[PDB]
Write an enzyme that holds these catalytic residues in place. Structure first.
Site, mmCIF file in Angstrom:
data_model
loop_
_atom_site.group_PDB
_atom_site.id
_atom_site.type_symbol
_atom_site.label_atom_id
_atom_site.label_comp_id
_atom_site.label_asym_id
_atom_site.label_seq_id
_atom_site.Cartn_x
_atom_site.Cartn_y
_atom_site.Cartn_z
ATOM 1 C CG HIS B 93 -22.070 9.134 132.128
ATOM 2 N ND1 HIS B 93 -23.313 8.967 131.194
ATOM 3 C CD2 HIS B 93 -21.703 7.837 132.556
ATOM 4 C CE1 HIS B 93 -23.387 7.566 130.887
ATOM 5 N NE2 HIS B 93 -22.566 7.028 131.374
ATOM 6 C CB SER B 97 -14.198 5.085 133.076
ATOM 7 O OG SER B 97 -15.244 4.747 132.684
ATOM 8 C CE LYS B 119 -11.218 -4.278 128.069
ATOM 9 N NZ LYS B 119 -9.880 -4.763 127.428
ATOM 10 C CG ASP B 120 -18.595 -3.131 127.626
ATOM 11 O OD1 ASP B 120 -19.386 -1.976 127.733
ATOM 12 O OD2 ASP B 120 -17.458 -3.363 128.146
ATOM 13 C CD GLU B 163 -28.383 -20.931 146.423
ATOM 14 O OE1 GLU B 163 -27.493 -20.933 145.609
ATOM 15 O OE2 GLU B 163 -29.165 -21.884 146.906
HETATM 16 C C1 HEM Z 1 -26.887 -2.218 140.718
HETATM 17 C C2 HEM Z 1 -26.073 -2.771 139.851
HETATM 18 C C3 HEM Z 1 -24.676 -1.840 139.250
HETATM 19 C C4 HEM Z 1 -24.692 -1.634 137.913
HETATM 20 C C5 HEM Z 1 -25.719 -2.369 136.931
HETATM 21 C C6 HEM Z 1 -23.309 -0.879 137.872
HETATM 22 C C7 HEM Z 1 -22.824 -0.520 136.600
HETATM 23 C C8 HEM Z 1 -21.830 0.125 136.441
HETATM 24 C C9 HEM Z 1 -21.502 0.695 135.165
HETATM 25 C C10 HEM Z 1 -21.933 0.601 134.022
HETATM 26 C C11 HEM Z 1 -20.390 1.255 135.333
HETATM 27 C C12 HEM Z 1 -19.402 1.648 134.342
HETATM 28 C C13 HEM Z 1 -18.350 0.850 134.005
HETATM 29 C C14 HEM Z 1 -17.350 -0.024 135.048
HETATM 30 O O1 HEM Z 1 -18.072 -0.882 135.602
HETATM 31 O O2 HEM Z 1 -16.415 0.389 135.326
HETATM 32 C C15 HEM Z 1 -20.307 1.332 136.948
HETATM 33 C C16 HEM Z 1 -19.095 1.948 137.704
HETATM 34 C C17 HEM Z 1 -18.911 1.941 138.882
HETATM 35 N N1 HEM Z 1 -19.523 1.333 139.738
HETATM 36 FE FE1 HEM Z 1 -21.250 0.377 139.711
HETATM 37 N N2 HEM Z 1 -22.689 -0.844 139.208
HETATM 38 C C18 HEM Z 1 -23.377 -1.477 139.792
HETATM 39 C C19 HEM Z 1 -22.924 -1.707 141.216
HETATM 40 C C20 HEM Z 1 -22.179 -0.947 141.687
HETATM 41 C C21 HEM Z 1 -22.025 -1.186 143.155
HETATM 42 C C22 HEM Z 1 -22.652 -2.210 144.254
HETATM 43 C C23 HEM Z 1 -20.555 -0.583 143.460
HETATM 44 C C24 HEM Z 1 -19.966 -0.971 144.725
HETATM 45 C C25 HEM Z 1 -20.638 -0.231 146.242
HETATM 46 C C26 HEM Z 1 -20.664 0.226 142.276
HETATM 47 C C27 HEM Z 1 -19.491 0.938 142.236
HETATM 48 C C28 HEM Z 1 -19.078 1.532 141.058
HETATM 49 C C29 HEM Z 1 -17.890 2.411 140.984
HETATM 50 C C30 HEM Z 1 -17.166 2.872 141.875
HETATM 51 C C31 HEM Z 1 -17.749 2.812 139.521
HETATM 52 C C32 HEM Z 1 -16.474 3.691 138.860
HETATM 53 C C33 HEM Z 1 -15.841 2.814 137.959
HETATM 54 C C34 HEM Z 1 -14.538 3.257 137.619
HETATM 55 O O3 HEM Z 1 -13.733 3.260 138.570
HETATM 56 O O4 HEM Z 1 -14.383 3.681 136.689
HETATM 57 N N3 HEM Z 1 -21.456 -0.113 141.438
HETATM 58 N N4 HEM Z 1 -20.996 0.554 137.561
HETATM 59 C C1 LIG Z 2 -35.193 -16.417 152.344
HETATM 60 O O1 LIG Z 2 -33.795 -17.083 152.746
HETATM 61 N N1 LIG Z 2 -32.932 -16.752 151.586
HETATM 62 C C2 LIG Z 2 -31.630 -17.283 151.879
HETATM 63 C C3 LIG Z 2 -30.799 -17.260 150.651
HETATM 64 O O2 LIG Z 2 -29.689 -17.749 150.515
HETATM 65 O O3 LIG Z 2 -31.511 -16.700 149.489
HETATM 66 C C4 LIG Z 2 -30.775 -16.540 148.392
HETATM 67 C C5 LIG Z 2 -31.212 -18.192 152.948
HETATM 68 C C6 LIG Z 2 -31.362 -19.186 153.033
HETATM 69 C C7 LIG Z 2 -30.911 -20.371 154.338
HETATM 70 C C8 LIG Z 2 -30.176 -19.474 155.181
HETATM 71 C C9 LIG Z 2 -30.013 -17.989 155.175
HETATM 72 C C10 LIG Z 2 -30.540 -17.198 153.977
HETATM 73 C C11 LIG Z 2 -30.619 -15.789 154.020
HETATM 74 O O4 LIG Z 2 -29.326 -15.221 154.443
HETATM 75 C C12 LIG Z 2 -28.903 -14.006 154.579
HETATM 76 C C13 LIG Z 2 -29.537 -13.162 153.679
HETATM 77 C C14 LIG Z 2 -29.112 -11.961 153.330
HETATM 78 C C15 LIG Z 2 -30.257 -11.144 152.740
HETATM 79 C C16 LIG Z 2 -28.046 -11.622 153.886
HETATM 80 I I1 LIG Z 2 -27.134 -9.643 153.658
HETATM 81 C C17 LIG Z 2 -27.184 -12.568 154.725
HETATM 82 C C18 LIG Z 2 -27.613 -13.734 155.100
HETATM 83 C C19 LIG Z 2 -26.651 -14.605 155.570
#
Ligand code: HEM
Ligand SMILES: CO/N=C(/C(=O)OC)c1ccccc1COc1cc(C)c(I)cc1C
Ligand SMILES: CCCCCCCC/C=C\CCCCCCCC(=O)OC[C@H](COP(=O)(O)OCCN)OC(=O)CCCCCCC/C=C\CCCCCCCC
Ligand code: HEM
Ligand code: HEM
Ligand code: HEM
Ligand SMILES: [Zn+2]
Lengths: 442, 271, 101, 49, 55, 422, 59, 54
Positions: B93, B97, B119-120, B163
């Site tokens: 914010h 976006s 949309k969401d 998984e």
């Molecule tokens: C913990 C989970 C997360 C939640 C619940 C979350 C949620 C959101 C929300 C609500 C938005 C605004 C709408 C949209 O999706 O564009 C957003 C935007 C964004 N999030 Fe996340 N996010 C998460 C994880 C991440 C992760 C792991 C990344 C990547 C390293 C990331 C990168 C971004 C970026 C770069 C934006 C900008 C969106 C745009 O380009 O407009 N977010 N995120």
């Molecule tokens: C406790 O083991 N849990 C596992 C799983 O898949 O949980 C959802 C599991 C089961 C079998 C073999 C390896 C794992 C965890 O492996 C992982 C876990 C994490 C975090 C990452 I980054 C990367 C790898 C490769």
């Protein structure tokens, strides 16, 4: 070419009169000239009951003398095209005249008369009382000053230096033909004076005229004794005069200085050269070299600000003063104290080289004319003892380097309790404590 | 959007850790062994690790002391995720976006409601459907069975594999023969993300108008699919070689191609 | 040796921002520099650049493009900002190297 | 006017040294600070432990 | 301070200026829905998460 | 070891001037004097000169707004613009070694400005302020309206851009103004602290765009108006004058002297001017404080002359009148042959003391080297000064009492008299 | 003049300051414990196993 | 912003709530319970987990 033009500048002649007084001058090929008496007197040399004499006197120094009252005195001077001016600060009073080198001698007479045989017609005093009394109410609206004064009044508090050069409002109201006399009496004395001149005048011719009107000889040895002043205690503190109806706000921050003698004063100046000064009319604006300046533009931090190194006989005030809107005070201060810090920590050789070339020009500048030369001389001697030449100064400056600055600023700035003067709508400056901490790390 | 991004990455990291612990809870064969295999990597660190592990376990091997602390951890982390998520949305914010075209939206912006709120919700349903669909008609389609066998430290499952969402990583870990190296590769395999920003060379933002980058992008995506697959397979030829390659290309793309094809791209626009 | 031109023209149609009625320089990501240049643009050129984008967005939201006859053409694309830009980058590059001195 | 204002007497609150309006506070400076800064410094080691 | 009641309320001013009056591009696609989804997703896991943890 | 050099002053084909003078001061001071100002401004481009005055720091085809400032600061240098309705001077000060360095910019600034559209607009608002600090002194408030209510053109224009035209000036207006007025024949490259040879080499091989006399300033016509700014101030500044003489004119020194005879400027800090009749006479009529003097302007094709007061709202009236009579009494053999003798020196002095400051001395050398191409030695301006008769004066004082007068005031005028009531 | 000397080499820069706390604390610990433990034990002379140990120790 | 704790969407929350926060000059000891209460929580939660882990 520079390196050379500095030597050709005619050495200044100095010869003392066997009665305590001293004479100095710099002869040039000029038709016009300037001369004056630079008395080592001031508001510092005053006291609770007399505070303001040196000024009240400064006021009656032209309303005649016993030899020739108001009308004639004024008439005599105007009529020859001369300009009789003068001032009077905490540690230095001065009465000087500007005229044709022709009047060279005749002039001295006038000067001489004023200091010694000053009229002091009691009828003119009750008239000069209402006057000063106005000059106050008018000077009482020049924040730039109201500040500095307040700054002094806390910077020194409980010491002579914490006094206005205009004196109290009461003192002005009740000073007497008596005390006024006394000041001149006790204060305007030969040894504590310097006859200075520069223009188209030969030391000889001059020196003589002095020997002629400045004849008052001293018998004892006490009349030869230069009274040493009881030093003033610096106090890290603050005084805040709040008035939200004031359009802008003024702020003065400083630390105790080293005093005229100390060489570092030079460095300290080179420093101030780096932080420089600014007002909304500078044209360089965002491109200026003084980081504090630039920022002051890139964020509209202030209206004006200045670095100052006031130097007194045994002390001094080092700092800065800015004016600004009620809502930018903080940011501004912040940035300022900041710069100050950088000084002690990461000052570069580029910052200094520049500061030096600036200072050089600034010094040279103070000596542009006759009036400004005698001022320097009237001062140099009275304060420093000898008289320092641009050749000397310059070298003393070429010797400074980054490393040198960081050390001197660190010495007088780093982790020191400072004096603060806030005046106007200052609700944002707040807390000495904070302001204090801004004295270290950056 | 640097911050919004980095917070993102962290959020991911936390999510990853979170699952990892949640998996151990049911204490089934896979639960147990996945724990051991992974946690045991830490012992590859020099000196300061052979200990970090016995500390993490609360013992000398994955046992109760661990289970319990994992449960606590699994209870905690989700909240920490929710927390950061708040910070994530904040840094967002601060700029708003980004849009598919990659050019100032200020010229034409609409109120989140009802445009995007509507949309969401549709988006929600269009997903929730398969989610429920699989979870209501094929429950264990995803989950391995060995986890229907109460953990037994004495016997090891035929194949130990996580998984799907950890597969890609597993595959990279197993590509490098040297616990320490593989560990690093795993770490960096995900940590790399932080670098991405500093690896942008195009004068344009979105790949919409950059064909070259696009395919490199899809080559990358598919490159993950492969790694995933390679992870669901044992350590025998060809797999192994295919494995090392895939991983090798994974880094290569995000490190050299992307930034390079970006520059080269720029010059074709004559910039 | 028209190799280059042949390519540049290709890629140009390859990226296809013309389809949206954009100009090369419209698509420019607004980093600090670009941000500056744009401010310098003469009222008209700027106001035009604007609409073009607002138009383009409206397309993208609609999930459409301009009719083939309205697309822009490699040689008719006006690099209205490049010059303004270069200079900015020149001005900055100067300042920067002078604060090192 | 502002000439009619003076900073009150802080006699009661001043430190034994910076009490004589004729003595350079600049000598006792390092002491005055070195003390409190010690209290502080100490309090940190106290916490640290 | 303000007319309506979602801009002058130190709380609704956060349920509003972040989900209702929030300035959004007019052309963001489906790849922007994952944001909220990710959220909603969390909102759920935590809930089912507890419900399980209670047994 | 140096000494007493002599002032060289060349002129090239294009009509450019080079006033030199090496005075072996450790600091040089070069400057470009020019015939420009609010005089050559048309109603359609007003203030364009003013703006041009601040536009100094803007980029040039040679130096960048940056290198201009940083480059000059780098050597403890400096530069600034100074202009009247008819004269503009671009000068830069510095240490001797840093001359040619401080030159690059000077040259560029005045001969090759790029007046970038944006830079310009990102400057316009400055006039809003520059003109705010200025008008902090009512002294400049009546002076603007004076010239207005005195003329109808050229000199009648303001020195500070009217408000309405603030921000409406163009880049083109700047250029055209410069291309039209900053031309060799109207330009003089004066300068102290240097050898004439150098200041010469620069001027020629370096100065272009010139060669010409450009546009002609609309001959200054006289109006004889009266402007009044009621604004509720404790004070009431007011100046009443009449067409005085012009620069170079013979009938000049007369006023310059009639001025001193009347009293203009003090020499005794916090005193009275017993020598000054005007002041004196005024004091005998008014009760409360004030100040009145002799106002004298000498322009290219015209001039202004009269007095100028300041006085408590209620005493404005009597203070102005008193001033008048004391001008008549002088206009009618009320001028002692002695008064003249004294004022003849007060002037010689004042002149002589002005040439101590390089800012005053450089000026002098320039002015002439521009409106003549000759530096009338010191003893010549002396022979030309006292060569004034008691008559020339009294008659100078009459020209005033009979000619058409034009007043201009700014204060609580409720007591201030109208021009027709004198 | 310890307070002076201190304020100079120690409490001056915020660096040497910190650096002191660290080292300083080190010493404090190392010797605060000793005193404390010693004090404590003394207040319990012959009650701790540290004392009555000699009565069953010998291989 | 000039400094870096008013222009940082985070430090602007660690600042404008604990450092630049405008506080009366006369509040007494009965105002300390606020932070204490907080710190209290910060601790219970911590010790709370540490236990929950066993
Ligand atoms: C913990 C989970 C997360 C939640 C619940 C979350 C949620 C959101 C929300 C609500 C938005 C605004 C709408 C949209 O999706 O564009 C957003 C935007 C964004 N999030 Fe996340 N996010 C998460 C994880 C991440 C992760 C792991 C990344 C990547 C390293 C990331 C990168 C971004 C970026 C770069 C934006 C900008 C969106 C745009 O380009 O407009 N977010 N995120
Ligand atoms: C406790 O083991 N849990 C596992 C799983 O898949 O949980 C959802 C599991 C089961 C079998 C073999 C390896 C794992 C965890 O492996 C992982 C876990 C994490 C975090 C990452 I980054 C990367 C790898 C490769
Ligand atoms: C890591 C773990 C990886 C595990 C695999 C994840 C599951 C893989 C499923 C396959 C995904 C296929 C999706 C098909 C989408 C096809 C499509 O729409 O392409 C065209 C279209 C073109 O867009 P514009 O140029 O803007 O159009 C202009 C206006 N008309 O592309 C897009 O929609 C944008 C691409 C976004 C989709 C990315 C999803 C892939 C997911 C993988 C994660 C990768 C990131 C790195 C993770 C590190 C850990
Ligand atoms: C960050 C969101 C969450 C994720 C990603 C997550 C993930 C998981 C995972 C990966 C499992 C293994 C499930 C299986 O057996 O197949 C699990 C189990 C479990 N989770 Fe969570 N969980 C989340 C939140 C929670 C929360 C917030 C709680 C309660 C504070 C919780 C409590 C449990 C419990 C009781 C189990 C063990 C029993 C079971 O497997 O059903 N989870 N979780
Ligand atoms: C959950 C525990 C709570 C925490 C951690 C907390 C914390 C704080 C803090 C940090 C302050 C500001 C400083 C101060 O103490 O004055 C505050 C103020 C206040 N809290 Fe709490 N509080 C808590 C519970 C409550 C409770 C239960 C009440 C009473 C129903 C309450 C009523 C208030 C009020 C009225 C103030 C205003 C203080 C003032 O008059 O300035 N708080 N609280
Ligand atoms: C709101 C702050 C907290 C309060 C007011 C609180 C209070 C208590 C109370 C009333 C007890 C019983 C202690 C006894 O046996 O005398 C307790 C026990 C316990 N609490 Fe908390 N608790 C807090 C936070 C936590 C948290 C955050 C956790 C971990 C999420 C936790 C985990 C436990 C555990 C493991 C026990 C049971 C074992 C024991 O009694 O030591 N507590 N807590
Ligand atoms: Zn299986």
């Amino acid at each position: 070419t520079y390196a050379q033009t500095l030597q050709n500048i005619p050495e200044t002649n100095v010869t003392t009169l066997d009665n305590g007084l001293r004479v100095a001058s710099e002869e040039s090929s000029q038709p016009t000239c300037t001369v004056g008496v630079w008395i080592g007197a001031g508001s510092r040399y005053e006291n609770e009951k007399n505070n303001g004499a040196g000024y009240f006197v400064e006021h009656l120094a032209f309303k005649g003398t016993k030899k020739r009252p108001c009308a004639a005195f004024e008439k005599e001077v105007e009529s020859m095209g001369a300009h009789f001016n003068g001032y009077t600060s905490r540690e230095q009073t001065a009465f000087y005249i500007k005229a044709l080198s022709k009047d060279m001698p005749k002039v001295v007479e006038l000067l001489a008369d004023v200091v010694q045989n000053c009229a002091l017609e009691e009828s003119q005093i009750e008239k000069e009382r209402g006057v000063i009394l106005q000059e106050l109410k008018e000077m009482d609206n020049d924040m730039t000053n109201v500040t500095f004064d307040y700054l002094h009044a806390t910077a020194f508090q409980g010491t002579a230096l914490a006094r206005t050069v205009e004196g109290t409002t009461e003192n002005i109201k009740h000073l007497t033909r008596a005390d006024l006399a006394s000041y001149i009496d006790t204060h305007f004395k030969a040894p504590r004076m310097v006859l200075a001149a520069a223009g188209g005048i030969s030391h000889k011719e001059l020196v003589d005229a002095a020997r002629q009107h400045f004849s008052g000889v001293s018998f004892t040895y006490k009349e030869d004794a230069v009274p040493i002043l009881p030093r003033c205690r610096f106090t890290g503190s603050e005084i805040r005069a709040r008035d939200d109806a004031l359009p802008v706000a003024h702020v003065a921050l400083a630390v105790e200085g080293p005093g005229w003698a100390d060489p570092d004063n030079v460095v300290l100046h080179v420093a101030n050269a780096i932080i420089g000064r600014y007002d909304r009319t500078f044209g360089g604006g965002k491109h200026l070299s003084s980081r504090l300046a630039a920022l002051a533009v890139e964020h509209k931090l202030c209206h004006s600000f200045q670095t100052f190194n006031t130097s007194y006989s045994d002390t001094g005030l080092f700092g800065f003063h800015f004016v600004a809107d009620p809502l930018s005070i903080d940011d501004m201060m912040f940035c300022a104290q900041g710069e100050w810090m950088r000084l002690c920590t990461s000052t570069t050789e580029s910052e200094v080289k520049r500061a030096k070339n600036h200072l050089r020009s600034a010094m040279v500048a103070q000596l542009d004319g006759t009036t400004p030369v005698c001022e320097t001389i009237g001062s140099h001697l009275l304060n420093y003892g000898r008289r320092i030449s641009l050749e000397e100064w310059d070298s003393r400056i070429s010797a400074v380097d980054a490393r040198m600055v960081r050390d001197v600023c660190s010495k007088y700035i780093y982790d020191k309790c400072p004096a603060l003067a806030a005046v106007g709508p200052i609700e944002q400056l707040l807390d000495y404590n904070r302001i204090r901490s801004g004295m270290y790390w950056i | 959007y640097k911050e919004t991004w980095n917070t993102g990455v962290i959020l991911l990291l936390t999510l990853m850790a979170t699952a990892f612990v949640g998996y151990v809870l049911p204490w089934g064969q896979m639960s147990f062994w996945g724990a051991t295999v992974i946690t045991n990597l830490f012992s590859a660190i020099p000196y300061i690790g052979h200990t970090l592990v016995e500390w993490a376990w609360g013992g000398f091997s994955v046992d109760n002391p661990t289970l319990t602390r994992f449960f606590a951890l699994h209870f905690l982390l989700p909240f920490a995720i929710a927390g950061i998520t708040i910070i994530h949305l904040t840094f967002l914010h601060e700029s708003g976006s980004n849009n598919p075209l990659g050019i100032s939206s200020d010229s034409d912006k609409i109120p989140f409601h009802p445009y995007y709120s509507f949309k969401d919700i549709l988006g929600l349903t269009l997903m929730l459907t398969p989610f429920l669909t699989l979870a209501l008609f094929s429950p264990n389609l995803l989950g391995d069975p060995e986890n229907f066998t109460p953990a037994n430290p004495l016997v090891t499952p035929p194949h130990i594999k996580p998984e799907w969402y950890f597969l890609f990583a597993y595959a990279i870990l197993r590509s490098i023969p040297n616990k320490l190296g593989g560990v690093l590769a795993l770490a960096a395999s995900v940590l790399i993300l932080f670098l991405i920003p500093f690896l942008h060379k195009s004068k344009q933002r979105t790949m919409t108008f950059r064909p070259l980058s696009q395919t490199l992008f899809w080559l990358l995506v598919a490159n993950l699919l492969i790694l995933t697959w390679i992870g669901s397979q044992p350590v025998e030829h060809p797999f192994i070689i295919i494995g090392q390659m895939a991983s090798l290309s994974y880094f290569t793309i995000l490190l050299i191609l992307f930034p390079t094809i970006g520059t080269l791209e720029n010059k074709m626009l004559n910039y | 040796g028209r190799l280059m031109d042949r390519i540049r023209k290709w890629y140009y149609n390859a990226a296809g921002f013309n389809k949206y009625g954009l100009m090369r320089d419209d698509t420019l990501y607004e980093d600090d520099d670009v941000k500056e240049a744009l401010k310098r643009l003469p009222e008209d050129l700027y106001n035009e650049r604007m609409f073009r984008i607002k138009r383009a967005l409206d397309l993208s939201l609609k999930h459409r493009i301009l009719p083939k006859e309205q697309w822009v053409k490699y040689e008719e694309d006006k690099p209205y900002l490049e010059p303004y830009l270069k200079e900015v980058i020149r001005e900055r590059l100067e300042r920067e190297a002078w604060n090192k001195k | 006017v502002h000439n009619d204002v003076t900073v009150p007497d802080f006699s009661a609150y001043r430190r034994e040294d910076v009490m004589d309006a004729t003595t350079s506070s600049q000598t006792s400076s390092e002491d005055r600070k070195g003390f409190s800064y010690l209290v502080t410094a100490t309090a940190c080691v106290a916490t640290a432990y | 301070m303000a007319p309506n009641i979602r801009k002058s309320h130190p709380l609704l001013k956060m349920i509003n200026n972040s989900l209702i009056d929030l300035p959004a591009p007019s052309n963001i696609s489906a790849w922007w829905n994952f944001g909220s989804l990710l959220a909603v997703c969390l909102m759920t896991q935590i809930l089912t998460g507890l419900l399980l943890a209670m047994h | 070891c140096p000494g007493a050099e002599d002032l060289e002053i060349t002129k090239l084909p294009n009509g450019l001037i080079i006033a030199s003078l090496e005075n072996f001061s450790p600091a040089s001071r070069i400057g470009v004097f020019i015939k420009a100002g609010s005089r050559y401004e048309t109603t359609a481009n007003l203030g364009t000169a003013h703006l041009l005055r601040l536009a100094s720091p803007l980029t040039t085809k040679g130096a960048s707004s940056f290198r201009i400032t940083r480059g000059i600061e780098a050597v403890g240098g400096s530069l600034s613009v100074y202009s009247t309705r008819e004269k503009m001077t671009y000068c830069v000060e510095c240490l001797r070694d840093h001359v040619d360095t401080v030159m690059e910019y000077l040259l560029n600034v005045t001969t090759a400005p790029e007046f970038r559209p944006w830079e310009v607009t990102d400057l316009q608002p400055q006039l809003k302020v520059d003109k705010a600090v200025a008008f902090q002194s009512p002294q400049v408030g009546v002076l603007e309206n004076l010239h207005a209510a005195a003329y109808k053109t050229a000199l009648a224009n303001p020195l500070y851009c009217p408000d309405y035209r603030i921000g409406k000036i163009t880049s083109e207006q700047l250029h055209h103004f410069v291309q039209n007025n900053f031309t060799s024949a109207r330009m003089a490259l004066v300068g102290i602290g240097v050898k004439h040879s150098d200041l010469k080499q620069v001027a020629e091989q370096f100065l272009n765009i010139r060669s010409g006399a450009g546009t002609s300033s609309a001959k200054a016509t006289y109006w004889g108006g009266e402007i009044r700014e009621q604004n509720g101030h404790s004070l009431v500044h007011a100046a009443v004058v009449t067409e005085g003489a012009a620069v170079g004119s013979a009938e000049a020194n007369a006023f310059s002297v009639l001025q001193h005879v009347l009293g203009a400027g003090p020499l005794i800090k916090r005193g009275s001017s017993v020598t000054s009749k005007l002041y004196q006479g005024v004091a005998k009529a008014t009760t409360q404080p004030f100040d009145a003097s002799a106002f004298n302007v000498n322009y290219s094709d015209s001039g202004l002359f009269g007095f100028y007061t300041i006085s408590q709202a209620a005493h404005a009236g009597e203070v102005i009148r008193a001033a008048m009579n004391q001008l008549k009494a002088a206009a009618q053999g009320g001028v002692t042959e002695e008064d003249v003798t004294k004022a003849k020196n007060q002037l010689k002095a004042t002149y002589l003391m002005s040439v101590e400051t390089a800012q005053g001395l450089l000026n002098e050398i320039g002015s002439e080297a521009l409106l003549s191409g000759t530096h009338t030695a010191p003893s010549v301006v002396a022979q030309k000064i006292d060569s004034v008769t008691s008559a020339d004066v009294v008659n100078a004082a009459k020209k005033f009492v009979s000619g058409k007068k034009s007043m201009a005031a700014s204060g609580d005028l409720g007591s201030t008299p109208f021009l027709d009531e004198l | 003049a310890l307070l002076r000397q201190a304020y100079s080499a120690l409490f001056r820069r915020t660096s040497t300051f910190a650096l002191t706390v660290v080292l300083g604390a080190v010493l404090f610990e190392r010797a605060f414990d000793q005193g404390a433990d010693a004090i404590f034990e003394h207040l319990n002379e012959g009650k701790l196993w540290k004392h009555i140990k000699h009565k069953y120790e010998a291989s």
